[PDB]
Design an enzyme around this catalytic site. Structure first.
Site, mmCIF file in Angstrom:
data_model
loop_
_atom_site.group_PDB
_atom_site.id
_atom_site.type_symbol
_atom_site.label_atom_id
_atom_site.label_comp_id
_atom_site.label_asym_id
_atom_site.label_seq_id
_atom_site.Cartn_x
_atom_site.Cartn_y
_atom_site.Cartn_z
ATOM 1 N N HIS A 243 23.937 82.339 2.184
ATOM 2 C CA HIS A 243 24.508 83.114 1.087
ATOM 3 C C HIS A 243 23.787 84.426 0.794
ATOM 4 O O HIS A 243 22.998 84.532 -0.145
ATOM 5 C CB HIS A 243 24.602 82.258 -0.184
ATOM 6 N N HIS B 41 32.005 87.610 -4.556
ATOM 7 C CA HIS B 41 32.215 86.179 -4.807
ATOM 8 C C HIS B 41 30.979 85.257 -4.752
ATOM 9 O O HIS B 41 31.056 84.115 -5.195
ATOM 10 C CB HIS B 41 33.297 85.629 -3.877
ATOM 11 N N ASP B 42 29.863 85.723 -4.190
ATOM 12 C CA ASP B 42 28.629 84.916 -4.145
ATOM 13 C C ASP B 42 27.449 85.708 -4.696
ATOM 14 O O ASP B 42 26.297 85.399 -4.392
ATOM 15 C CB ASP B 42 28.266 84.500 -2.719
HETATM 16 C C1 LIG Z 1 29.806 74.807 5.797
HETATM 17 S S1 LIG Z 1 30.052 75.134 4.064
HETATM 18 C C2 LIG Z 1 30.379 73.585 3.324
HETATM 19 N N1 LIG Z 1 30.274 72.468 4.059
HETATM 20 C C3 LIG Z 1 30.519 71.259 3.534
HETATM 21 C C4 LIG Z 1 30.411 70.128 4.335
HETATM 22 C C5 LIG Z 1 30.675 68.871 3.804
HETATM 23 C C6 LIG Z 1 31.048 68.742 2.470
HETATM 24 C C7 LIG Z 1 31.154 69.872 1.667
HETATM 25 C C8 LIG Z 1 30.890 71.129 2.201
HETATM 26 C C9 LIG Z 1 31.006 72.266 1.409
HETATM 27 O O1 LIG Z 1 31.312 72.169 0.221
HETATM 28 N N2 LIG Z 1 30.749 73.519 1.975
HETATM 29 C C10 LIG Z 1 30.853 74.691 1.214
HETATM 30 C C11 LIG Z 1 32.071 75.354 1.095
HETATM 31 F F1 LIG Z 1 33.167 74.891 1.729
HETATM 32 C C12 LIG Z 1 32.168 76.517 0.340
HETATM 33 C C13 LIG Z 1 31.042 77.028 -0.298
HETATM 34 C C14 LIG Z 1 29.824 76.370 -0.178
HETATM 35 C C15 LIG Z 1 29.729 75.206 0.575
HETATM 36 F F2 LIG Z 1 28.540 74.580 0.683
HETATM 37 MG MG LIG Z 2 30.285 80.303 -3.860
HETATM 38 ZN ZN LIG Z 3 30.963 82.188 -0.238
#
Ligand SMILES: CSc1nc2ccccc2c(=O)n1-c1c(F)cccc1F
Ligand SMILES: [Mg+2]
Ligand SMILES: [Zn+2]
Length: 318
Positions: free
Chosen positions: A74, A114-115
């Protein structure tokens, strides 16, 4: 020399295989600013809203430097990527043929921010460690709310839109907020279900602001998790960086006895199992629906890569 090769890459900024990492290397970590400024010019937003180019650079720089370059995932590079993916979606027929300069303006800004000022740890971590942000936003979309109020902070401080009426600046803030909050992964079932209902009823009217922004919110959600939709070489780098950030939160949790969150344990969770599950349960459902909405080649390409990349992770096992 290096800054001369960057200009050429921007000629293909609408290409799905754009290499954001190279672009950021060539610009010395100025990809968000350089790419977003170009998109403003490319979409003619500078003329359309009589933008002071000096104020625009300041604003874009405040955004880029508000990202923590120390977070492996991020950071401003991730923002630049989401912004670039957003641009490709705006080029799609159904959106290209209905969005107004104003929509494009809110879309790109929301993507870029957004982040904003992301701390590198997730919501449950902020909640259980009693971080003031969790208090401030009552344990609800803590991060997304923080990114948005921060964006509103830089928007006001930049005076980029001071010449526009207050009402307009306030609406800009409200609509950017709605776009940013939709990226709270935690609430995807609600957003995906709504989108799906509409696609089933086939009642979406793009000339309606509300329907159009629901779509833009879904496009921002896609842009935010389209890493698995890129060519393997790009997708692989993102998978390693997001996992590295997850594991670091885990190491902290382990060291301070906070309880190791899911996906954050480097000893019990494989980078492959993480990506596979992510692609299966979050990425694939979203992009399938989006493909029902924008049934174009880009949609097939994106789902295609998810298919290939995923198999590669399974393959990278036994
Ligand atoms: C690779 S980002 C992500 N991976 C996950 C894997 C398993 C379960 C949940 C997530 C998840 O929430 N994210 C995610 C996302 F899709 C968006 C923003 C931040 C994250 F960590
Ligand atoms: Mg976010
Ligand atoms: Zn993001």
């Amino acid at each position: 020399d290096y800054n001369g090769q960057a200009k050429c890459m921007l000629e293909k900024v609408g290409n799905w295989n754009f290499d954001i990492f190279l672009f950021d290397r060539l610009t010395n970590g100025n990809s968000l600013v350089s790419l977003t400024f170009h998109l403003f010019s490319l979409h003619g937003l500078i003329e359309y809203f009589h933008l002071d180019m000096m104020k625009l650079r300041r604003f874009l720089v405040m955004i880029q430097e508000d990202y923590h370059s120390q977070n492996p995932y991020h950071n401003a590079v991730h923002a630049a990527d989401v912004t670039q993916a957003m641009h490709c979606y705006l080029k799609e027929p159904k959106l290209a043929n209905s969005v107004t300069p104003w929509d494009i303006l809110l879309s790109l800004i929301a993507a870029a921010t957004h982040d904003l000022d992301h701390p590198g740890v997730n919501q449950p971590f902020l909640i259980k460690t009693n971080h003031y942000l969790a208090t401030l936003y009552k344990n609800t979309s803590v991060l997304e709310n923080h990114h948005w109020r921060s964006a509103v902070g830089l928007l006001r401080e930049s005076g980029l839109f001071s010449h526009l009426p207050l009402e307009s600046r306030q609406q800009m803030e409200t609509q950017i907020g709605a776009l940013i909050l939709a990226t709270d992964i935690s609430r995807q079932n609600e957003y995906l279900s709504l989108f799906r209902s509409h696609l089933d009823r086939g009642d979406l009217c793009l000339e309606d602001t509300r329907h159009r922004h629901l779509v833009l919110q879904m496009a921002l959600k896609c842009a935010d998790i389209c890493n698995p939709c890129r060519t393997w070489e790009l997708s692989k780098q993102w998978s390693e960086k997001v996992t590295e950030e997850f594991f670091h939160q885990g190491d902290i949790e382990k060291k301070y006895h906070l309880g190791v969150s899911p996906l954050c344990d480097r000893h019990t969770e494989s980078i492959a199992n993480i990506q596979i599950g992510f692609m299966t349960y979050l990425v694939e459902p979203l992009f399938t629906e989006w493909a029902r909405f924008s049934n174009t080649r880009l949609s097939q390409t994106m789902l295609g890569h998810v298919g290939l990349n995923k198999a590669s992770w399974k393959g990278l096992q036994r």
